[PDB]
Ligand binder design. Structure first.
Ligand SMILES: CCCCCCCC/C=C\CCCCCCCC(=O)O[C@@H](COC(=O)CCCCCCCCCCCCCCC)COP(=O)([O-])OCC[N+](C)(C)C
Ligand SMILES: CCCCCCCC/C=C\CCCCCCCC(=O)O[C@@H](COC(=O)CCCCCCCCCCCCCCC)COP(=O)([O-])OCC[N+](C)(C)C
Ligand SMILES: CCCCCCCC/C=C\CCCCCCCC(=O)O[C@@H](COC(=O)CCCCCCCCCCCCCCC)COP(=O)([O-])OCC[N+](C)(C)C
Ligand SMILES: CCCCCCCC/C=C\CCCCCCCC(=O)O[C@@H](COC(=O)CCCCCCCCCCCCCCC)COP(=O)([O-])OCC[N+](C)(C)C
Ligand SMILES: CCCCCCCC/C=C\CCCCCCCC(=O)O[C@@H](COC(=O)CCCCCCCCCCCCCCC)COP(=O)([O-])OCC[N+](C)(C)C
Ligand SMILES: CCCCCCCC/C=C\CCCCCCCC(=O)O[C@@H](COC(=O)CCCCCCCCCCCCCCC)COP(=O)([O-])OCC[N+](C)(C)C
Ligand SMILES: CCCCCCCC/C=C\CCCCCCCC(=O)O[C@@H](COC(=O)CCCCCCCCCCCCCCC)COP(=O)([O-])OCC[N+](C)(C)C
Ligand SMILES: CCCCCCCC/C=C\CCCCCCCC(=O)O[C@@H](COC(=O)CCCCCCCCCCCCCCC)COP(=O)([O-])OCC[N+](C)(C)C
Ligand SMILES: CCCCCCCC/C=C\CCCCCCCC(=O)O[C@@H](COC(=O)CCCCCCCCCCCCCCC)COP(=O)([O-])OCC[N+](C)(C)C
Ligand SMILES: CCCCCCCC/C=C\CCCCCCCC(=O)O[C@@H](COC(=O)CCCCCCCCCCCCCCC)COP(=O)([O-])OCC[N+](C)(C)C
Ligand SMILES: CC(C)=CCC[C@H](C)CC=O
Ligand SMILES: CC(C)=CCC[C@H](C)CC=O
Lengths: 617, 617
């Protein structure tokens, strides 16, 4: 990455800056006596700070910590309060593009100087001073560190709970404060949080602290600049631990019960009927966590992300309620559409007229749905290798070719077999999408979807750049026969040599040495080295490479089948009419202070291994 | 899963119920003074309990434990004994379908309230109050928790030995009590027990406690509702640790010697001749543990389940006594029957008449045995992939086709070669069952039995749905020749195109471009993409998939060969006559109190690694 001018370097006002660097208080005593009357005519002490970047000696002293630093800070504060400029001195900000709005308290917090940090707030800091800068607000994740550009989140993004308690007891803190990105403190903790369970992580523990110290719902209901309360921000950023904690969170103490999400009912040993609350989980309005966690591409930790308590049961109930009954209906009504293509294609005209226009209207419906589905998606969705747009595009082609054929048939262009036969061969090959069910058979289609995109195009490109060179050479090595007989020089042209040299790869045809070549010792050399270099090397090294690929992705297939299952589960939801949406879940709990707690789904989960380990002691 | 109305919720009699919920004794003082004369006219205190589910305030207070709960229980008991309804109050039962017969002591035990549990039995509990309900007695294993529906097993199914001791010293406990499922306490411990050795498990330790406190044989000889003393219940449910403990169990103390099963004789270092007792182990009557552990499908922990001391030696002795000598006899007498089919099939009539009806009578015997064997099995046995019914069905077909052929031969239908040649080709292919012996060769047949059922039908179905679409398209792309020559359009019909397009897959035949097609650029595209998509992708991705399958199941083959070996060992037992069963094991030990301890098999086992590790200290 790149940055602007540095915040500190070591390449008569510079003498104070050099004195506060190493922290020489004995040297720092006398220059301030000199500075009290240094050009005391009128300047309004602007020479105390620097004008190139807005730096003062305070944040320069806190920029590099030495064992003697407290005396420097107290001497600087005692000097600043003499000239009645302490408010302007402690509220000093950087004035560059990378760093803008940076205060001395912001640097004091991050240097683990909790004892020093109490001094600036005692002198009076604005606290709410944002840090809107290019460094503090990076574009990607590799040119800076992000912390919500608020000083309170410094003690939150870095494990400093004592400064969190010190800032909480302040009268002017503004816990419900936005920023330039519109985030809040909980959004900041969501962003810094670590997805994988890597032993102890302070973010999950400190979320409880900040939320219990808030004691209200405004911190978890405010939206981002795009608009995201942190429940789905933890989903989009790919944070499994934080989402698991926020989805299943209950407070066993009174006076804090509205913040709870998982109201337990009874714990009868291995069984525990937990009444879960869902308000941004079910796809009711938009941007639900269930919708975000399935329409995402960059997430790699979806092994454990989909199998939470208010998501797995929700998906299973949706599948058993309205997804399987329509999946089988779609399978039957597409198999019939593919079968009625055989009665038109194979039985072409070289009372069975009831199905002549059924294929036309169903191709029209398929096209008018896939045209919406292909532009509703963004180009970022196709960047993933296992994207769902490939089948959405194949299904679209299967409709455009059919409608083009039936358009050209009655227009009499003699092309009613050009696009209809390709539509046929693609439609029978399109049946490997409706194997989303049948778990054992569903294991098999993603092997296609991964192997063909990982090993087939690479070996195909190598074999194409291999066959092209040998094809030109073998066609150039032969000689033109004097046309006394037509059966001369079987490797006649480049197009014929390509076919005759490709037939040798599969294993059908014949091999000859008298191909009207004046250099048989050279013809045979090339013909032998082609089969040696490709059939002995490439055709079986491909097998060896997929022997590693399938071994690597055999344990990964279980989650990637369930991903396609959940995607086609939620895709059929959008196709429902609004009046058919009456089959919602259980809701209107009314077990809160003065309202109804949205919708609350009752699940009855059991865990016998965990209960066996717990009861073992 | 689903459930009935919940046992507790938080959505002038309800005030007492709310007071006992959080356990506010200071609030609980005055309402009872109010309730003493509340409508004291005559109701016979029915308002103290609820009528919707039969709940009282006692089990509601024990439903959620708070640090102050003992005073609530003692105040409720002191109030109930005043109105002389303590017996009806403490013997209160739930009255719904899911929960029926549930008492307050049952809820007090499971909440780890051992100090509270002594109070209700001191007041007087019926103890033997069953919990016959749909929740306590689930159908499958995923809609409830099962514990034998007796309160004594609550302290047994949950690790609470102190309450076991408290219930044992009671005068009215009825240790030999059945239930609605006919189980006993040992059956309950067998059901809850954990099969794999997962560090410490309280069930195996507490079995010793309950059996030594019983001190008799009635607890381990009572049968289930179907009829199972727990030795084979531990076998059918798949519990390796519990079965290992119960099979090899000895008490070194006097006054408890009839309960012992493994009477040791001498321990001469690495060798220890252990005299084992077998009463429900040998297949003498029915339902032996050895018979149950081999005729089971759902068990996955049979790696260590078959190799116990009174089972492995029993199987080895049976094999060396009467199973190998009949296996070789069956192999010879079936190879002769398959060889004498060649002298009839290949030498058909387009003094060798001694073998013309031998095949007929042996096919009759094979059919009359396989017809019994195919309906003696249940449909649950065929659900397993590696079931023994496939060979039992192939052997049956090999007899029905032969008898149909020899029936149609002398009836003169000219079909004596239609079913006889298929019977021949199936009979020579049926020889891959008699490779149960030859350990290295026996490793090879289960590779067939697994690979063909896991990878062959899936790739075959994909290749069939692939070849069918290209077959119709390639046959439709060609044009009908004007019949001036017969050698026109080699891809003539669909049936011919299927064969010509299948010959390209194996690698024999020829490839041409002038197939009387008006669209050669389209014919060649389909012909090239078929070989690309199938021979380059499917035919070798199958190899890559079995490269993972064989690697995964290479370590699993050792147990699955021995499973077929034990199954064909015990299958030949049933074929023996009753008079031939005189070759039993050693029995009539008479080393017990006043009887003969059934049969007792002497084995001489050695263990040098264990003795080397033991003597090392
Ligand atoms: C304005 C007018 C039309 C636009 C709105 C049309 C609404 C109805 C669409 C019906 C339809 O496409 O049928 C579908 C079946 O669906 C069923 O079986 C249920 C009906 C058929 O299409 P599909 O099975 O969805 O196609 C499979 C591929 N995909 C799942 C990747 C898309
Ligand atoms: C080739 C693949 C074909 C896939 C077919 C669709 C499908 O998923 O089938 C499903 C069958 O689905 C049914 O049982 C549907 C029954 C018809 C419902 C029609 C409306 C009834 C409305 C009435 C008012 C299979 O789904 P499953 O049985 O849940 O899969 C799990 C079983 N497994 C582990 C064996 C795989
Ligand atoms: C007449 C027999 C054909 C049917 C046999 C079904 C046997 C029971 C199902 C079964 O075992 O599933 C099979 C699927 O198999 C399929 O999904 C088959 C699909 C139909 C193929 C039809 C070809 C014509 C095997 O799948 P599995 O059980 O997941 O395999 C276990 C994996 N392991 C063997 C490596 C441990
Ligand atoms: C019209 C589609 C063709 C292009 C498809 C590109 C798809 C995106 C890139 C992509 O996934 O890279 C592919 C490369 O693939 C190549 O490098 C292709 C080279 C060109 C082949 C042209 C043949 C004609 C795959 O490479 P990868 O992503 O490193 O593979 C991940 C490995 N894993 C699958 C085992 C996990
Ligand atoms: C990707 C493949 C890109 C090339 C495709 C070539 C297809 C065949 C082709 O046109 O070959 C061309 C060669 O031209 C060559 O051989 C060019 C080789 C370098 C490119 C021409 O091949 P042809 O038509 O058999 O030659 C007849 C000569 N005529 C075209 C003047 C009548
Ligand atoms: C493993 C990887 C497999 C290989 C990978 C790909 C390799 C392929 C090489 C295939 C060899 C045969 C083609 C050359 C011969 C031929 O007929 O050429 C034709 C062109 O034909 C095409 O242009 C076909 C379309 C492109 C290739 C097929 C798609 C590949 C997709 C991926 C035309 O030839 P011509 O000379 O103009 O014919 C004169 C016409 N006349 C006789 C009717 C008068
Ligand atoms: C009332 C009248 C008849 C019913 C009762 C008939 C009793 C005798 C049966 C003999 C018999 O089937 O021979 C057997 C050999 O067996 C021997 O070699 C020992 C004899 C031949 O059959 P098998 O070798 O058992 O067949 C192998 C396949 N199986 C083991 C899966 C079944
Ligand atoms: C093809 C497979 C063929 C299998 C043949 C049967 C069989 O299991 O053979 C057996 C041979 O069995 C004998 O030795 C039998 C001797 C004939 C007994 C006939 C009655 C005698 C009665 C007289 C009164 C082989 O069994 P095994 O030698 O115990 O196998 C272990 C050796 N291994 C590790 C080398 C594999
Ligand atoms: C599993 C396979 C199920 C189909 C088996 C087809 C076998 C061949 C067959 O009957 O083809 C049929 C086509 O019909 C088709 O091509 C149907 C394709 C869709 C099914 C007919 O094929 P054929 O008999 O060669 O055509 C002669 C026409 N005649 C039958 C009117 C005389
Ligand atoms: C790797 C996977 C391998 C492939 C998997 C399976 C693929 C198989 C495709 C096989 C291609 C050849 C069959 C078509 C040609 C033929 O002779 O058809 C015949 C039908 O023949 C049958 O119906 C055969 C039985 C079914 C297929 C074989 C069992 C597959 C089991 C699994 C009859 O054809 P016809 O037109 O009626 O003949 C006229 C008769 N005359 C000439 C005598 C007058
Ligand atoms: C296997 C799969 C998912 C797609 C293959 C379809 C090919 C392109 C047929 C083309 O005619
Ligand atoms: C390999 C094995 C166990 C069985 C194959 C027998 C096949 C079905 C021959 C059919 O004719």
């Amino acid at each position: 990455p790149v940055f602007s001018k540095p915040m500190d370097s070591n390449i008569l006002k510079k003498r104070i800056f050099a004195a506060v660097s190493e922290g020489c208080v004995e040297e720092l005593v006398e220059l301030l006596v000199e500075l009290q009357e240094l050009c005391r005519r009128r300047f309004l002490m602007h020479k105390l700070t620097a004008s190139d970047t807005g730096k003062t000696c305070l944040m320069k002293a806190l920029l590099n910590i030495n064992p003697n630093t407290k005396e420097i800070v107290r001497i600087l504060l005692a000097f600043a309060e003499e000239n009645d400029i302490l408010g302007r001195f402690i509220n000093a900000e950087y004035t560059e593009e990378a760093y803008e709005g940076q205060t001395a308290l912001n640097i004091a917090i991050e240097r683990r100087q909790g004892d020093i940090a109490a001094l600036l707030i005692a002198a009076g800091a604005d606290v709410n001073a944002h840090a809107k800068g290019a460094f503090f607000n990076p574009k990607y994740q590799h040119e800076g560190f992000y912390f919500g550009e608020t000083p309170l989140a410094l003690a939150a993004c870095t494990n400093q709970p004592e400064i969190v308690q010190l800032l909480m007891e302040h009268e002017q803190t503004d816990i419900t404060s936005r920023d330039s990105r519109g985030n809040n403190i909980l959004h900041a903790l969501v962003t810094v949080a670590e997805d994988f369970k890597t032993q102890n992580d302070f973010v999950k523990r400190m979320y409880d602290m900040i939320l219990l110290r808030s004691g209200n719902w405004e911190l978890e209901t405010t939206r981002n600049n795009d608009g995201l309360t942190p429940l789905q921000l933890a989903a989009k950023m790919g944070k499994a631990e934080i989402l698991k904690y926020i989805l299943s969170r209950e407070i066993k103490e009174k006076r804090l019960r509205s913040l709870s999400r998982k109201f337990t009912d009874w714990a009868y040993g291995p069984v525990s009927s937990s009444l879960y609350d869902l308000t941004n989980v079910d796809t009711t309005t938009d941007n639900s966590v269930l919708e975000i966690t399935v329409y995402n591409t960059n997430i790699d930790n979806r092994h454990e992300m989909l199998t939470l308590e208010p998501l797995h049961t929700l998906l299973h109930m949706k599948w058993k309620k309205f997804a399987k009954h329509m999946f089988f209906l779609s399978f039957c009504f597409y198999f019939f559409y593919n079968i009625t293509l055989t009665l038109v294609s194979y039985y072409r005209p070289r009372l069975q007229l009831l199905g002549r226009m059924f294929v036309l209207i169903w191709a029209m419906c398929i096209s008018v749905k896939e045209g919406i589905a292909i532009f509703l998606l963004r180009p970022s969705d196709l960047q993933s290798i296992l994207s769902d747009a490939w089948f959405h595009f194949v299904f679209f082609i299967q409709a455009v070719l059919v409608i083009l054929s039936v358009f050209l048939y009655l227009f009499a262009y003699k092309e009613y077999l050009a696009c209809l036969v390709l539509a046929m061969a693609l439609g029978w090959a399109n049946m490997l999408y409706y194997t989303r069910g049948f778990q054992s058979m569903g294991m098999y289609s993603v092997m296609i979807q991964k192997v063909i995109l990982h090993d087939v195009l690479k070996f195909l490109f190598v074999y194409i750049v291999f066959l092209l060179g040998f094809g030109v050479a073998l066609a150039s090595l032969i000689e033109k026969c004097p046309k006394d007989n037509k059966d001369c020089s079987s490797y006649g042209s480049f197009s014929d040599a390509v076919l005759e040299l490709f037939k040798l790869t599969i294993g059908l045809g014949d091999l000859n040495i008298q191909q009207n070549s004046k250099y048989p010792i050279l013809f045979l050399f090339l013909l032998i080295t082609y089969v040696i270099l490709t059939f002995v090397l490439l055709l079986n090294m491909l097998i060896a490479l997929m022997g590693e690929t399938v071994e690597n992705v055999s344990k990964e297939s279980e989650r990637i089948w369930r991903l396609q299952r959940a995607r086609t589960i939620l895709e059929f939801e959008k196709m429902l009419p609004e009046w058919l949406r009456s089959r919602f879940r259980m809701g209107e709990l009314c077990k809160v202070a003065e309202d109804d707690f949205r919708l609350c789904l009752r699940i009855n989960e059991v865990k016998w291994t965990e209960w066996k380990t717990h009861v073992s002691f």
